[PDB]
Amino acid sequence: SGFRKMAFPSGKVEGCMVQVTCGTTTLNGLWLDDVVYCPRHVICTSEDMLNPNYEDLLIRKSNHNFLVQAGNVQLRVIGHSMQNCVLKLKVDTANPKTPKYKFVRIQPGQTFSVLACYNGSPSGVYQCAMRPNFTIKGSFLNGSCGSVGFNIDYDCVSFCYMHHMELPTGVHAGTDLEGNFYGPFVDRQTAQAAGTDTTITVNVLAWLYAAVINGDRWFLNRFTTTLNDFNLVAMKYNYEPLTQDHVDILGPLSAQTGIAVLDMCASLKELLQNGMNGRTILGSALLEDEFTPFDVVRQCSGVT
Amino acid sequence: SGFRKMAFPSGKVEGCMVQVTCGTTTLNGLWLDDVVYCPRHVICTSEDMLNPNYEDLLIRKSNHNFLVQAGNVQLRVIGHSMQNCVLKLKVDTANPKTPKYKFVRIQPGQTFSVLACYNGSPSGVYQCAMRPNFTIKGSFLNGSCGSVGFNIDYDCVSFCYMHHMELPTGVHAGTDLEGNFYGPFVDRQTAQAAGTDTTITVNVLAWLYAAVINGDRWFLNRFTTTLNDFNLVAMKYNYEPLTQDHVDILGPLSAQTGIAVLDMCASLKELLQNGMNGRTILGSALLEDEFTPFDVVRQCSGVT
Numbered sequence: 001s002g003f004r005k006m007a008f009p010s011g012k013v014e015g016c017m018v019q020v021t022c023g024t025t026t027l028n029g030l031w032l033d034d035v036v037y038c039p040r041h042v043i044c045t046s047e048d049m050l051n052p053n054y055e056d057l058l059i060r061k062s063n064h065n066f067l068v069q070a071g072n073v074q075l076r077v078i079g080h081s082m083q084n085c086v087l088k089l090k091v092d093t094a095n096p097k098t099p100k101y102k103f104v105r106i107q108p109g110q111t112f113s114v115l116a117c118y119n120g121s122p123s124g125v126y127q128c129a130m131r132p133n134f135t136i137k138g139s140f141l142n143g144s145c146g147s148v149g150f151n152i153d154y155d156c157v158s159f160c161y162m163h164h165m166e167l168p169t170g171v172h173a174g175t176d177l178e179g180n181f182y183g184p185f186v187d188r189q190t191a192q193a194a195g196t197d198t199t200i201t202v203n204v205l206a207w208l209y210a211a212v213i214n215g216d217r218w219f220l221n222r223f224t225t226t227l228n229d230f231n232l233v234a235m236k237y238n239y240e241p242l243t244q245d246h247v248d249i250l251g252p253l254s255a256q257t258g259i260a261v262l263d264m265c266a267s268l269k270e271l272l273q274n275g276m277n278g279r280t281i282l283g284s285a286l287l288e289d290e291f292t293p294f295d296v297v298r299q300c301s302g303v304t
Numbered sequence: 305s306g307f308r309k310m311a312f313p314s315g316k317v318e319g320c321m322v323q324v325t326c327g328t329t330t331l332n333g334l335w336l337d338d339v340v341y342c343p344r345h346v347i348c349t350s351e352d353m354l355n356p357n358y359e360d361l362l363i364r365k366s367n368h369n370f371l372v373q374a375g376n377v378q379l380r381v382i383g384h385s386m387q388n389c390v391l392k393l394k395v396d397t398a399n400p401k402t403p404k405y406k407f408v409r410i411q412p413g414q415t416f417s418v419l420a421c422y423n424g425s426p427s428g429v430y431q432c433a434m435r436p437n438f439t440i441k442g443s444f445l446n447g448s449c450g451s452v453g454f455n456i457d458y459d460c461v462s463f464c465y466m467h468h469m470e471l472p473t474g475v476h477a478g479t480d481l482e483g484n485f486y487g488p489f490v491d492r493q494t495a496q497a498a499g500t501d502t503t504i505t506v507n508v509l510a511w512l513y514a515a516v517i518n519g520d521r522w523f524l525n526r527f528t529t530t531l532n533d534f535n536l537v538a539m540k541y542n543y544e545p546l547t548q549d550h551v552d553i554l555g556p557l558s559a560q561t562g563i564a565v566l567d568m569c570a571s572l573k574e575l576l577q578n579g580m581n582g583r584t585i586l587g588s589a590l591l592e593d594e595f596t597p598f599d600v601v602r603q604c605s606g607v608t
């Protein structure tokens with residue numbers, strides 16, 4: 001029993017983190033096989049960052065200008081290329097600690113662990129969601145760029161995020177490991193505002209199921225609703241629309257608790273309309289939306 | 305910017321987790337040098353658990369009854385002893401991944417990371433505090449016993465907790481790595497109630513400082529207070545008394561923000577008396593108390 005915001009064990013990803021230095025800019029790189037992946041803005045002077053032309057900036061960089069350090073040993077860079085907003089640095093040594101890995105581009109609402117690093121050294125691990133506006137609400141100081149977000153499936157690390165940007169509002173933006181930004185964000189020190197940070201409805205419901213499973217039942221009510229009726233209330237409260245796809249996904253939790261998805265929807269409807277009235281669910285005074293249905297099943301079943 | 309509930313990177317501790325089996329009971333062990341530490345209740349039939357006599361139960365166990373598995377390789381047990389509520393299993397192989405380590409007994413209010421394991425395999429990592437009633441609010445299913453809590457100081461893992469018990473109320477109890485329970489708890493399936501789960505006042509203040517540092521300032525007020533005046537309000541709200549020791553500890557955050565500790569106390573006083581009024585601080589609708597002042601400084605400075 002008990003339910004916690006839980007990150008994947010970070011060891012497999014700690015084994016991949018290196019320091020990348022280009023001139024006076026130091027950030028983090030991900031070392032998989034003989035490639036080091038890092039944000040392309042490593043080549044910028046914070047003056048370049050106002051309107052960088054990356055292809056033009058990169059012409060001035062040779063392999064030997066990229067200083068790659070794994071622990072206290074230098075890696076020899078034998079190649080470099082730009083893919084979208086990341087640099088791939090070919091090194092002469094395969095990372096001996098390379099885990100089984102995939103690159104995946106996640107959807108909004110999908111959760112992942114972040115290993116926050118500075119100078120290629122891990123500081124901490126935390127759980128995130130890709131927000132519906134394609135920002136993440138991270139913890140990233142200067143030097144944290146190139147820190148990565150991941151899921152683990154037993155022994156296979158799926159890398160879904162590399163950190164690039166803090167928006168003026170202190171939310172975060174980054175790329176998949178093909179260098180493609182989540183959302184409309186660009187690696188330029190310019191005015192970039194996030195859209196509406198809506199609540200991930202299906203995640204909230206997952207977490208209400210986690211609550212029932214863990215004995216927090218006070219908010220269960222006598223009501224049901226319909227997707228269309230629920231969705232009117234959701235819209236009004238800046239909750240994402242709920243689809244039959246989300247209902248299907250919640251089916252296993254529905255089964256385990258014997259609470260119909262639409263009944264739990266009706267419960268969530270009353271919490272939105274009535275508020276918590278100073279009560280808590282799983283030690284939270286607000287509705288948590290950074291647990292996916294898969295996260296809830298995982299932590300409630302104890303997958304390793 | 306941004307502030308997250310952040311666990312230590314778990315890699316150093318993943319390298320220490322083994323499976324311990326005694327008869328039909330499987331749980332987790334911590335492998336440091338040539339010793340495997342695990343809960344002594346590994347020797348119990350859940351029938352033994354009602355009123356176990358551990359010294360008597362242990363007489364019936366030989367080295368070869370303790371099955372220790374690190375990955376998919378068996379360790380040879382060449383010795384076993386009981387220290388308080390843990391077994392020390394001497395094995396013939398030093399853990400080659402043994403990190404620099406200490407055993408520390410933490411005080412209530414102190415935070416640590418837990419690496420939740422099942423069958424010696426990591427499932428997840430999360431951040432905890434030792435509650436003032438010497439429980440922790442964990443996420444632990446059957447098989448999780450012997451999962452450990454730790455702090456890291458650069459390269460030195462301080463182990464402070466091993467998981468043993470879920471109380472009937474679904475809160476958690478365990479030992480330091482000398483086998484001594486935190487609080488008055490015993491490894492027996494009996495009526496054990498926790499005392500008052502009071503709020504860790506100094507941690508709440510730390511987290512209010514983290515909020516100001518990260519731009520969440522709305523709750524800063526025009527008032528100050530005194531320790532004695534603050535403490536009357538704290539008592540009324542089941543907050544731990546604040547000492548000059550806690551004020552001293554908050555000094556660095558006081559300095560960085562230019563907010564006197566007692567001013568921040570007066571802010572916390574108004575939040576207790578007035579509530580949040582539907583507002584959030586660092587994405588929370590309640591006052592977070594599982595960040596220590598050291599945690600706030602660490603994450604706000606980016607220590608690795």
Ligand SMILES: *CC(=O)N1CCN(S(=O)(=O)c2c(F)cccc2F)CC1
Pocket residue numbers: 024025026027041045046141142143144145146164165
């Ligand atoms: C995002 C990231 O981690 N980095 C890119 C920016 N640089 S930097 O330009 O060197 C820099 C500092 F070193 C300190 C403060 C601001 C700043 F932009 C850091 C690495």
Ligand SMILES: *CC(=O)N1CCN(S(=O)(=O)c2c(F)cccc2F)CC1
Pocket residue numbers: 328329330331345349350445446447448449450468469
């Ligand atoms: C605390 C812990 O992880 N364990 C001790 C109890 N045992 S058990 O007695 O084998 C057991 C199960 F295997 C399943 C359900 C309940 C139960 F007590 C599990 C390991």
